Amino acid sequence: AAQTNAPWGLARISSTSPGTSTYYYDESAGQGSCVYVIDTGIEASHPEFEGRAQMVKTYYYSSRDGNGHGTHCAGTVGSRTYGVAKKTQLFGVKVLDDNGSGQYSTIIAGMDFVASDKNNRNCPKGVVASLSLGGGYSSSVNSAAARLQSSGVMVAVAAGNNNADARNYSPASEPSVCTVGASDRYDRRSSFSNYGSVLDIFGPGTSILSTWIGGSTRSISGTSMATPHVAGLAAYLMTLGKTTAASACRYIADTANKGDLSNIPFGTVNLLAYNNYQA
C-alpha cells in the first residue's frame, strides 16, 4: 500500500525523515485487530468508517459523539483516508462528556469495561486501547491503566499537553503502558508536549488532519492526536505478527526513528514512531 498526498502524520510514520507526502504500508492494513477509543465517542455513521466504527459503550445520556475529538482520533486510528490502520474495528467507549470532561469513576470504569469487553469482540490479531484522555496524577487511574495492559490490551496514553514531566499526569505516568509524545512535522517535539522518563515513543501530535463530527474532517494539535497514530500502528503491527499486546511498546521503541527529533530534554527518550514497511 501507498496512499499519496496523505496527512503529514501518516506519511511521517512510514518515513525515516520528514518531508514525504505519501503513506506506505502492508496490504494487511489492520484487518482483524480491534481498537478501543476511550474519549467522547464514535460518530460511526461517518462515510470514512465504512461500518468499522461503533459505540460499544457509553456512560452518559447517548452514544452520540458531540465533541468531535472522540471521532477525530477514531479516524486517526481506523479511518480509510485519515487513519493509520485502515481495516481495524473501532470500539468506542464514551467516558467523556461534550463539556470536554469527566470523572475518574467514569474514566476508570472505561478502562475496565474494556478489560472485559475485549472478550465479547473478536480480535484474533490483538486489541489496542487508546487513552484519549489525561488529568493530574492519580494512583487509581494508573492502576486501571496497568490492569488493562496486564490484561493483554495494548494501551497508548497521551503524555499530556502541559509542557511538563508527564510523571505528574495520569494515566500517562503508569510504567507498564506506552506513553506517547507529540512531534511537529519538522521533527521537533511539539510545544505543548509533555516529556521525561516515562514517555516511550513520539508521534505526530501536531496540525493533525482527521475525521470530525457531521461528515467533516478537521485538524487539531495535541499529544492525544499523537496516540491514535501509535495505537493505529500498534494495531497495524499486532495484526502483522510482529508483536503481541505486551510486546507492542517494546517493539515500537526497538523499531522507531532513533535520534530523529529535536527539542528533546534530558532523560526524555529521543525516538519517533516508525512503521517499518519496507515497501
DSSP 213-266: STT-EEEE--HHHHHHHHHHHHHHHHTTTS--TTHHHHHHHHHSEET--BS--S
Beta bridge partners of residue 33, listed in sequence order: 126
Burial class (CB in 10 A: 0-12, 13-18, 19+), 227: buried
CATH number at residue 8: 3.40.50.200
Name residues whose C-beta falls within 8 Å of residue 125's C-beta, 6 or more positions apart in sequence: 31, 32, 33, 34, 235, 238, 239
Structural domain span for residue 48: 1-279
Catalytic residue among 14, 183, 193, 224: 224
Tell me if 171 is assigned to a ligand binding site: no
d(CA 52, CA 154): 19
Phi-psi region of 19 (alpha: psi -120 to 50; beta: other; left: phi over 0): left
Tell me if 40 is assigned to a ligand binding site: no
Q: Where are the extended beta strands (E) located within 73-206?
A: 89-94, 126-131, 135-136, 153-158, 169-170, 178-184, 188-189, 201-204
Centroid of chain to Cα 262: 22
Is 46 known to be catalytic?
Answer: no
Is 173 known to be catalytic?
Answer: no
The stretches of the chain forming alpha helices (DSSP H) are 8-13, 69-78, 104-117, 139-150, 223-238, 247-255
Helix (H, G, I), strand (E, B), or coil: what is residue 23?
A: strand
Tell me the CA distances in angstroms from 169 to 172, 183, 203, 252, one per residue in order.
6, 19, 18, 22
Amino acid identity of residue 178, one-letter, is C
Is 224 known to be catalytic?
Answer: yes
Q: Let me know: does 116 contact 68? Beta carbons within 8 Å.
A: no
Amino acid identity of residue 24, one-letter, is Y
Number of domains in the chain: 1
Experimental method, per PDB record: electron diffraction
Catalytic residue among 39, 65, 98, 165: 39
Catalytic residue among 15, 33, 65, 69: 69
Name residues whose C-beta falls within 8 Å of residue 221's C-beta, 6 or more positions apart in sequence: 182, 190, 192, 205, 206, 207, 208
Tell me if 175 is assigned to a ligand binding site: yes
Among 262, 213, 198, 204, which residue's Cα sits nearest to residue 231? 204
Q: How far apart are the first and last CA of the chain?
A: 8
Tell me if 260 is assigned to a ligand binding site: yes
All cell numbers assigned to 72: 477525530
All cell numbers assigned to 32: 482483524
Tell me if 265 is assigned to a ligand binding site: no
